[PDB]
Write a protein that binds this DNA or RNA. Sequence first.
RNA 1: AGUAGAAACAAGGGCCUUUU
Lengths: 537, 50, 686, 36, 541
Amino acid sequence: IFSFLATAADFLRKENMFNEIFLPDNEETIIEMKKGKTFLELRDESVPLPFQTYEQMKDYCEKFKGNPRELASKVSQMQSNIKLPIKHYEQNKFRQIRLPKGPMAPYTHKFLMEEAWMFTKISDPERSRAGEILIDFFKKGNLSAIRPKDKPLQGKYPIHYKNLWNQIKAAIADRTMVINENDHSEFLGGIGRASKKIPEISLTQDVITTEGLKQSENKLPEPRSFPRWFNAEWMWAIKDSDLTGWVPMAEYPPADNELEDYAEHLNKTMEGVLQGTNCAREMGKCILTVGALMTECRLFPGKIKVVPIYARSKERKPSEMDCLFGICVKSKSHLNKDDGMYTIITFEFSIREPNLEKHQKYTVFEAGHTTVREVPLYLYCRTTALSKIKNDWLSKARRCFITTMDTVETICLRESAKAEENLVEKTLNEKQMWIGKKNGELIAQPLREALRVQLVQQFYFCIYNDSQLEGFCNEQKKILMALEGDKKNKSSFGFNPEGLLEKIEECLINNPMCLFMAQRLNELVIEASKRGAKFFK
Amino acid sequence: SKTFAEIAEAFLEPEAVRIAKEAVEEYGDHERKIIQIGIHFQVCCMFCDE
Amino acid sequence: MEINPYLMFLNNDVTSLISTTYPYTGPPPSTKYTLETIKRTYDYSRTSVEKTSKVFNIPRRKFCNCLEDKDELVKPTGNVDISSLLGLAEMMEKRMGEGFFKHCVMEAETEILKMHFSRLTEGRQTYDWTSERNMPAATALQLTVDAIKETEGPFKGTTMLEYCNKMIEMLDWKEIKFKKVIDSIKHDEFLIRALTINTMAKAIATPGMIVRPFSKIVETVAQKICEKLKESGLPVGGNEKKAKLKTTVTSLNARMNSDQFAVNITGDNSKWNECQQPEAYLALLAYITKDSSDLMKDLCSVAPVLFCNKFVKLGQGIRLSNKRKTKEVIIKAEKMGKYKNLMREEYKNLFEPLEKYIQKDVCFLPGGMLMGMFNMLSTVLGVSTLCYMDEELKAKGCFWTGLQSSDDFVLFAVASNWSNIHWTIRRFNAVCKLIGINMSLEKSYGSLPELFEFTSMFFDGEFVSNLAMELPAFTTAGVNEGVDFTAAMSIIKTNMINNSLSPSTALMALRICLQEFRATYRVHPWDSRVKGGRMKIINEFIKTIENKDGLLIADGGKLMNNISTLHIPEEVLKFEKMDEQYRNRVFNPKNPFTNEAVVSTHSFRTMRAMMAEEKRYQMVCDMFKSVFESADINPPIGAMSIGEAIEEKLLERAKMKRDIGAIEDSEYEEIKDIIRDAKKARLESR
Amino acid sequence: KVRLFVGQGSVRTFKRTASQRAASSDVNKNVKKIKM
Amino acid sequence: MSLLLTIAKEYKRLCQDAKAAQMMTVGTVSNYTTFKKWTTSRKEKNPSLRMRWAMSSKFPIIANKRMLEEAQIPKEHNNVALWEDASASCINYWNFCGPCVNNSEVIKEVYKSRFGRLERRKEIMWKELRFTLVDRQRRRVDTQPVEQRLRTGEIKDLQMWTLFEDEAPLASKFILDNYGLVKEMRSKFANKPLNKEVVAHMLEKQFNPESRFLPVFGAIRPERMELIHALGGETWIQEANTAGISNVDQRKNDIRAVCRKVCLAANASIMNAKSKLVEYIKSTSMRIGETERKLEELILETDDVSPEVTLCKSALGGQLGKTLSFGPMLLKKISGSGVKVKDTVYIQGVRAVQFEYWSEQEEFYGEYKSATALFSRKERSLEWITIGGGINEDRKRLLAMCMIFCRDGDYFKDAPATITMADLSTKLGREIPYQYVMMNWIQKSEDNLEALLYSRGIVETNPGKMGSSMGIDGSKRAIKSLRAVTIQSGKIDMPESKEKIHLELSDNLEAFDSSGRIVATILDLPSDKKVTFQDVSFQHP
RNA sequence: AGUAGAAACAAGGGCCUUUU
């Protein structure tokens, strides 16, 4: 008896069932929720309007019987007082998306891509630090020649930028990349332009009269029209950079089976193709520059450090090379909380005249000359801002390779399976992918050359991501599904497309990517209307 | 182990479980007691020890 | 030229490229929102009937069985006809079988009773009714149990039911004490503070700790029900729902007659939470709990009334400012009424109608639902609609089936003519409107067979894995060196098995993860030239390290892992090669620094009044583990208190080591005397 | 007889005599008898 | 030692306090678990970023002082701040040169699972990558080859009785029964410098077969499912021979054979078949690898959804899956309901024979060798059947056994002339219902099967439906085809449900499951066969 | 100045909070 009882008590204690509940005595055999006065007072007040006490509701529900006649009658009466519209798209076509109106969308990415002009220097493994590279570049003397003019080509706050440039040069000369807090740095960094909190207990109507007091008149964004310069950036980003290996990479591992050899051959081909472009140069510039800025804001907050805008590359087939696109600085990055805010400042070189509509952000300064023969210079001085999250994601922008490879091998394996043979090189070399129009015709090029377009798409998704693009890309899917339905003669339909288009056009504001993609979507539906239906002109 | 009978079969023999279950059904009491009665019945049978 | 990337959709399948649209490669991104939600909720309820409570003395709008204002019904309505809901419940019960719900409530009651009250700790952040702030579950539970202990006496309970009965008693109590830098509060303020539900802007609700157990009980009943149903997909995930859809489509294409032709409708309900009422849930749980023990009847009945009486806190108030924006005033919700003039016309128009409902920094809301609270019960309520079947449809040769998860469904209608398809869809819309469940007209669309979408998964002849959704997962968690790489490889393996990830994409992600790993821990290969103190020391000593191949990735190693070796950590593949001295040092068990992972050296461990209690519990647990080395794996159990166990085990250890081990009778007697003194002090003290 | 700490927080008493009769057999026999 | 004295002084200091004394005195020890949560509660949203943030720090690592001092490793070998009086670089110094453990060959036992994985993988001869649209079926499987699979309770006792004996719980039945396994585990991990928690966690993983619901193609064996990701996807297949690795099917097969043998023995006793069966099971054991295990525990652990195991699990009282059977066929009720309804069938001229048939709509997944189906019945009629198999014969056999399951067709109304009253029933004094008679009839000869299939109406293959049609020889398409017999390509995905139903059995070995349904019987097993069992013990007269 | 969204930052406390 005692052995059995011991085992049983162990197996109860294990399950949390060694209590009066499961093992009560003779008297304590009535377990019940401790109904309280207030709980009942409330429960008796939540019973629906017909009933007035939980008892009536319970008695009516426990005995509820089905009367399908009444239920069907009510269902039909509700089905008649509604009149749900049904709209087959073939009859009711999708009108073209309406784009906002106003001035051209302006450049917003931190670092210039197309315009930016760079300085190269032979790599030194010993001196591999950011500051070490910046000092080495300064020592040759080309950098010390720069002497911006007083009058800028365009923009505002020139004096501050000129003073800061001189102070940066003095800092580097001193081999201490710490800037002092002066009026110019204070104004650009907004060290003290944070509104000071006023207590409410210390308030009175007289205080309200002395200084105006009214609820903040939220200044929603303003609308900007389609950018005509985006296509140029895309075409430029789809060209080689005269250098290769801009973005770093790991070392490919060994192989044992044929499958691994196939994976390594495809990966090698794609990486070789993708390492020579210009977009990848910007990937490298972002990875390294943000890594350095991340490792500075972590160590030296409260000190306006100086960080370069640089990259590392390799001459084609050879030696390595350090490139210096420009210079950055970061105001106090006291990131006490997640999703903080810390202003930075960006100087970047160029050999091109500034557009008014595009380069509205920047404040250029013509800066002497540079050899290649001699050419004028232009010092593009921006003042942007960043956060932790943007930093981490830019520093992990290498993600785009994964997506692009996935799409390419999702096309190649599918094309190869329908024939039960290895058809990848043929698909890559031959399969033609429309990539635009020229002279009213549809241009097309093999996949091997449209990987560049795909990569640029993913990179721009990384760069310009916001709530607007999110909403857009979430609401455009319906249109693409409708397109597919049209392609296969499936008589698709909908309930209220106008509201859908309205929702879409609501999320098109001051973001170049959204607007450009919408214009392209309209051109697509137009070109397909020639060979399909369900779309209006 | 979603029902009490399985938890009782973990240590109690299933026969005593069935017995206590029938007993609870005849009395009409909660089935949460399938364990306690089963234990008592087992104690008696094992107590007898032929 | 004008480059257009969408042109690939002209002559290529849309699914095989839909992944390109998702901008999941980049970073994602009050009171006005809450006030708009409150207003829309009070508006959807079309009725104007208002009762008057006595406990609160607040007008209480009744959102059930009082439908009026039948204008523009297309829009969302939040009134419910309990008769229709109960009829649908009867239809589902009939289809499933006799006594379908009793087995379910039995399988729930089998757990609710034995459940330990420490399970509450595992949950999202819960509002605290003492400091009036969101706080992890464990801290809130400890705080409220300390309040109980200070008030009347230590909580001897150890189970869920005891905790609930003590909460019910606490509602009656006139006064409740709780520790603070130790204020006391009357019955009414704690009554309001228990129901108060905060919000987190991730939005999502944060209910009080008083209501959490009842919510768990209701959710458990809803889960045990939903799991049986074959027309739902909320608890399940990934492969399961795809297989469900495949079986459903096969069944459809077989049942339909030759004359009949099927259709699909991808639906996305709107205002799901705003239009659901907890009173319909109350009646439904009453109908379900009609035969089971009165205990489950009351326990289930509790949570609906609490939600039907839930206040909602307004957070962070408005901000005031001057023209130049130099100055700036901050104002909380409680004071909003005072400076009613100093607000935009829109904000005033929104605020003024709710003033009567508004209480200090709260707005009593007699109904509505919030995100995440009752997912599975709404899923059940919505699956009820698909079962419906009436004489008219069979007379016309029409029938609809489908699959709904929370606020997202898929419908499969069948009929013989489009004129009847439209009528069928309208009938479905009506029956769903009868229970608050609405439907969006813009985000919802339909088409002929084999082209739908369900929870970001597009379906055709095949089913394209989104992959975008899983892209953020390809990151190093950031725990330590050993864990990170293995975890990344396991994530790649899972994505390969389920999301049908390709091999080359896997290899690229593996290289990307290896390079981010090398970058974070400031490590680089031996042959590389990333000069550093670590690297230089590594390089010189690598001359001593004879086997280059065996080197660990963190210690200037190389990648020896591939598609066929993702289910094997690196430490295992390299074991044979690893130099004997290097291997011995690497896996020496005792070292200063020293879950499918190997434990090596690379593993490293890198508001004060509350810290005091935390240190007290920490010390107690720490030294109980010091004595008992199996305290964490196997939960302790017994009848002895902690002190008694320590006393006896320590004495036994001392006796064992005086018998044979290196201890002297003097030392044994000293320790035993110390133990006796400690026991006496403990018992006498309190 | 001898007292002994067992597991955690359990002090019991053990006697060195083997007493493990068949439980299944006896229970079955009694249950069969109950049906007459 | 002195450490003991320190522990005692610490306990004294804590008891001198008032609050700690109160909480220790009151209640039981389980409170520890609870307290283990009220402390050290803190997580972080993005740990990766946090780690990168911290690593940059001047001194990221934390190291115990006594370990560093004991090591006597230079403070700064070359002007590097290993510790104030620690950097990550320090670990490198230790790894390259430092205190060496006497031996590290124990790690091979701690992680026996992963070394087993590597050892199994090294013996795979990869044949050839091909490309094709693979047919994948979503089904529950196990992805880890494991020997002597146990439950969590047994595992917990194994850990306690192999590592912490001084704090071992009262001796359980399992520990006494399985003492060779406990001894083997104890020897390896006794008197060793080890982190005990890690070893316990790894033994937990050692004895847990990871069951997952996955897409699958080809054979089903844990040795493959652990690396299925590197054998084939939706579009490609990397051929490989994995037959001879960790043979787990031969012991399952032997267990089923033994259950068949004992179930067929214990049908002789009409009055006391059940008791004889239980006695027969208890007085038998079998050897697994090195250890010898009792058949009852093996049956409880196993997951073979087969009538033999189902019956034995019922007899012992083990709960089992919601899985029906009908001969060498498998079934799974997706939906529906019903209730028994008797009807007569005349065997020859006028010979009434009663048979019960359900009355309601009822969907049913089915599974015969290399074939699957999703049929439905309604009031004694086969409403439809959708097949997704890949073999003509398996398709025909599945369709026939399904038709029989639902007692559709004229033969049930008016029995075939051939079948006689001698075979109808009472082979050994027990009636054999009509359905199992028809099953034996169809197995007896193909011609009867052809007649049965002919019984189902035949129509002309309409246009378009040619592909979704099945002839009499299981043709993919024909000019005339069986009525309401849809055909498709791709195996029907197996449903899933984590439910456990208690089910008894009658004196005639009829397993009821809380309702009329007959889950399994002895009349759905191979007739008989002779086998020579190895390493088994039939200790019964 | 700047960022972005349907609200917040534009340091906070009393002197403190370098290698892809």
